[PDB]
């Protein structure tokens, strides 16, 4: 039935480092699901392009049609990847807002990889102290390998060890994805 992977990116710049790693991860997840013998369809959503819809959802309990279809598709997905820039030592307000807008049971059981990017790695704990508690509150199953891209640390032993990590996170998710019947 072709496995489905939703990806939520919350970067604001162009190019977006957030979208960069979100892509690195989703590409890796496709590679892993392929290795497990299946095809993976990845649908990415850039939150900066849902601003008016989110702004509307704040001043009107009713969601636009565009938003209603996006969250519905999300809940229907087999796997999920979420990525965010680090603003004020944590996830982005826009990022959180998207999740605020979701129904309580929107991600129950949802296999998920949490990711974040920044210059250095001093704020990498944002993964376990911010995103993890969030996806956990929503009963999603967040794989152990969280991905934190420190732009300043790409290339060399570090960079290669990092790509090794993205693959590891990808495998964990891929395994959970092909497991669902």
């Amino acid at each position: 039935h072709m496995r489905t992977l939703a990806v939520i990116s919350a970067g604001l710049s162009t190019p977006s480092s957030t979208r960069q790693i979100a892509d690195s991860i989703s590409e890796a997840v496709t590679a892993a699901v392929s290795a497990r013998g299946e095809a993976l369809s990845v649908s990415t959503i850039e939150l900066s392009e849902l601003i008016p819809d989110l702004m509307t959802a704040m001043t009107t309990r009713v969601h636009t049609t565009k938003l209603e279809e996006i969250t519905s598709a999300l809940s229907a997905s087999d796997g999920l990847v979420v990525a965010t820039p680090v603003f004020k030592a944590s996830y982005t307000g826009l990022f959180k807002m998207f999740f605020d807008i979701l129904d309580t049971d929107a991600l129950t059981g949802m296999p998920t990889i949490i990711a974040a990017t920044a210059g250095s790695a001093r704020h990498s704990l944002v993964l376990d102290y911010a995103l993890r508690p969030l996806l956990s509150y929503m009963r999603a199953v967040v794989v152990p390998t969280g991905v934190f891209a420190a732009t300043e640390d790409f290339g060399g032993p570090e960079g290669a060890e990092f790509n090794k990590r993205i693959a590891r996170a990808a495998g964990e998710l891929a395994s959970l994805i092909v497991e669902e019947s």
Copy 2:
């Protein structure tokens, strides 16, 4: 020179529980600064009324005039009170977004009381694991007594012990406010 107190409320409903306690706190802070012999001018900002400006700041590095004046007034204040509803077991995306929009040194040294509201008190730790790290990252000095309003727990011994707490938090802030020359 009349001490100034900025108050950021992020509730969305009307009436707003968030604004309710934000008021309870600011009233208490005025009472405490009065006791220390001075007058306190409290300027409250409802974030739900800055939505278009925040939505604009997300898709344009330039802030509106209305927003530019609000953040400037904020940084100029003597004290600060921040209040938020608890969405998805943490602060509101709109709340965070407001802070994302601030300059790095916007609140350096700013005396502050962090507050949050919800039905029960099971998510009260959001004060130390969400708001505290945030205002701390911005080098603001957050008073020890954080205020968490559990609507279900108003009235009776609890309610009276709570009002006692708001006064305590108010005193801590008031002391810091009249200290600045």
Copy 3:
């Protein structure tokens, strides 16, 4: 081969509320693994009875024989349950110490249920902001349903909804346990 479940309890009092729920959970896990057609052997360790060994491990890199066998058994287990009292708004120093003493890869992939107990539920977020980050740092897979026993909230609708939760957490773990070949 009879599935194995390790249980780490860190209570100090007798009776121990911590051991009480640790038992409630392990009993529930046995019931769930039984329903999936298998037998579950549960080995519980009371940390208060490993004090001298832990005290020794702090002043001597070498672990006692009793401790060496306990951690080895742990790593070999199919599933894990960890429970702790809430001291100073977080997990117990003794609890943490036990984990400090473990090898870096001691719990990699380990299916786990995190649990904690206290009078009220105001410190229930300790599960996602303390224990979750900890077991996650050790690459253990912590099931979504964390268990927080608020002694004051036993019995009635709450209590019955709670037992419902323990069963839910038990199922998540049981599923992961019978999955390992």
Copy 4:
């Protein structure tokens, strides 16, 4: 009356990086209190030398005499500095245990600098997500500048910017210390 500064170090190795920075900080605090015209008496406690007393306090509600005098001196201090190594992505079990052993009101109002050390800085958020919530729960007033020593980052622009930070944290504390009458 000569201002008093208590220092709790929880390192286990010798030399202790933890004690190293704990000293760097306390030296800086003495320098700052001197600049404000006073003398600072610094009493440092190495937790690894209180192990038997802590081990005893776990299996006996009664504290040894040595421990009773140490906590009493602590509560009587004008300022406090706490430092810890990072084990399993957070503070040390021994560190926490020391605080578990304290009376609820032992540090109310206590001016404090929180510090931690590790090779890299990827776990620096432990300051705001672990130590801050802890000292805050005890109503101590933790200065904004937390100190995180990343051994790998000493020397050069970073190292010099770091020493600049320690001085900043020292000033915040020193100001609070000479303020108490």
